[PDB]
């Protein structure tokens, strides 16, 4: 049984290009950028489906 993926979720082909290492609120959160629309999301929690 493989849990299928909901409606929201987007298809992102992983690659090294995405996960930069930037600064946000002191600390160097390892931001993920999300190709579709550049929007680095430092903290793991709250990325975008």
């Amino acid at each position: 049984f493989v849990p299928d993926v909901p409606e929201g979720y987007v298809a992102v082909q992983y690659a090294h290009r995405l996960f930069s290492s930037s600064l946000a609120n002191k600390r160097n959160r390892v931001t993920y950028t999300h190709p579709p629309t550049g929007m680095a999301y430092p903290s793991p929690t709250g990325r975008p489906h």
Binding site: A24, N25, K26, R27, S43, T45
Partner: protein
């Protein structure tokens, strides 16, 4: 006449300082014992006590 009331059996003068203490006891700056906590779940980033 001393007899009609009796303040509270407290010196006529100390009662006067006492006028101040209730004032001191109510002053915001000395309330530091807040009531309710709120539980939820955010990420402590840029912690501003307030």
């Amino acid at each position: 006449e001393a007899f009609r009331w009796s303040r509270y059996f407290l010196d006529e003068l100390q009662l006067r300082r006492l006028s101040v203490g209730l004032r001191l006891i109510t002053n915001p700056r000395i309330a530091r014992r807040f009531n309710g906590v709120r539980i939820m779940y955010l990420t402590d980033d840029d912690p501003d006590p307030d």
